[PDB]
Write a structure and sequence with these properties.
Actin, Chain A, domain 4; binds adenosine-5'-triphosphate; protein domain specific binding; 3 domains; binds calcium ion; 39% helix; monomer; binds kabiramide C; globular; six-stranded mixed sheet; Nucleotidyltransferase, domain 5; alpha+beta; Actin, alpha skeletal muscle
Length: 363
Amino acid sequence: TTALVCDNGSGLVKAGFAGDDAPRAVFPSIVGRPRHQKDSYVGDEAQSKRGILTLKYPIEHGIITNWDDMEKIWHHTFYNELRVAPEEHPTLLTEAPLNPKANREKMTQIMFETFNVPAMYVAIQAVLSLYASGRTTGIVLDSGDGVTHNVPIYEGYALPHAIMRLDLAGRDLTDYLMKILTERGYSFVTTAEREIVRDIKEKLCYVALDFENEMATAASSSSLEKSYELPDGQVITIGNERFRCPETLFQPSFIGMESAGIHETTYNSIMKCDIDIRKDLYANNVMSGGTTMYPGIADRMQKEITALAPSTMKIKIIAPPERKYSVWIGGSILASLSTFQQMWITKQEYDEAGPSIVHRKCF
Ligand SMILES: CO[C@H]([C@H](C)/C=C/N(C)CO)[C@@H](C)C(=O)CC[C@H](C)[C@H](C[C@@H]1OC(=O)C[C@@H](O[C@H](N)O)C[C@H](C)C[C@H](O)[C@H](C)[C@@H](OC)c2coc(n2)-c2coc(n2)-c2coc(n2)/C=C/C[C@H](OC)[C@H]1C)OC
Ligand SMILES: Nc1ncnc2c1ncn2[C@@H]1O[C@H](COP(=O)(O)OP(=O)(O)OP(=O)(O)O)[C@@H](O)[C@H]1O
Ligand SMILES: [Ca+2]
Ligand SMILES: [Ca+2]
């Protein structure tokens, strides 16, 4: 009996089989319907046929907002991407920190009534990422395509009163890179061009240890410049934009947001926790999600947190190499454990108790 693990993000779905080291399927969280031969398309195919479709993202800042399109995503995941019959597999799903109770119930109803799963469970994304690092205590910085959270976790369980949310993440960074490249004299505005710039961001951007110092290097030399061959055949050159783009995480004012940067929100989150556990959190800052993939980010975070924390505090930033998929991995591990098998919501329990069973069984 093989459990499935489906990690639904704002930008990407990561899906596969519990016990595997990586998701089998990773595809965009998009649903397309024809503009005025199929009635709907999902993921890669929807992207490929965009010219004749209207696209929608059913998950916004980590929260499911379009339930009909979300059902389409799950159907596509089971039947087309993984090629499984969902009625044959226990299914672990993930959710954002502070996901409303009613959303959890809707997820539960759909899984049992629409897909007829034999069992299910819903876990908090950041908690899973911590488990994937071999820890049950620490503070997670989870940053994806749509949302960023700080989530302190103690002895296996999130501390909800100390969780911080920031609606600044990868899509915002892609858009800002587009803007600053256009200012350089290139032209990136269209949808095809957004996809191109996202690739540039992922290949060439990095976090500077010191922003001003690196700006000065870029102003007076070509040493930080890299080139990129566009699909249309123009080779462009990229310099300070490489580190200016993700600098926005530390200084959101670059895109006109008033928020604290990720170092300050981490600190604020720790300070909302019991004094007895803060040292444990400071020593176990774990980074998760695609927007934490920038080279240089761990060292920069070490620097910035050290400057905020008491002078004698021991601080460690952990940045696992597989952290694009840490949420999914944690789910794969959790759903594999013998101790976990009693934690599943069963179809019998659903049939008797209804969707609210999820509140009794899922932390
Ligand atoms: C039962 O759950 C309770 C509670 C009821 C739940 C509460 N909530 C859900 C709260 O919200 C919960 C508190 C708790 O116990 C969770 C435990 C965690 C999932 C986790 C469990 C441990 O698990 C852990 O400690 C996880 C770590 O395993 C190891 N062995 O140290 C992960 C590594 C550091 C990194 C990977 O090697 C690396 C990322 C990569 O390696 C190739 C990899 C990718 O995928 C995998 N590894 C993978 C997928 O499946 C597995 N690995 C697998 C499936 O089973 C296991 N491994 C078993 C490993 C033995 C571990 O102990 C060393 C395991 C017990 O501990 C951090
Ligand atoms: N090497 C990289 N450098 C910078 N960003 C990257 C890199 N790899 C992936 N990303 C970005 O990570 C994002 C996707 O990450 P992830 O899958 O963790 O997000 P999600 O789960 O879809 O979104 P969210 O968690 O915000 O709901 C995209 O914005 C993508 O461009
Ligand atoms: Ca995510
Ligand atoms: Ca500011």
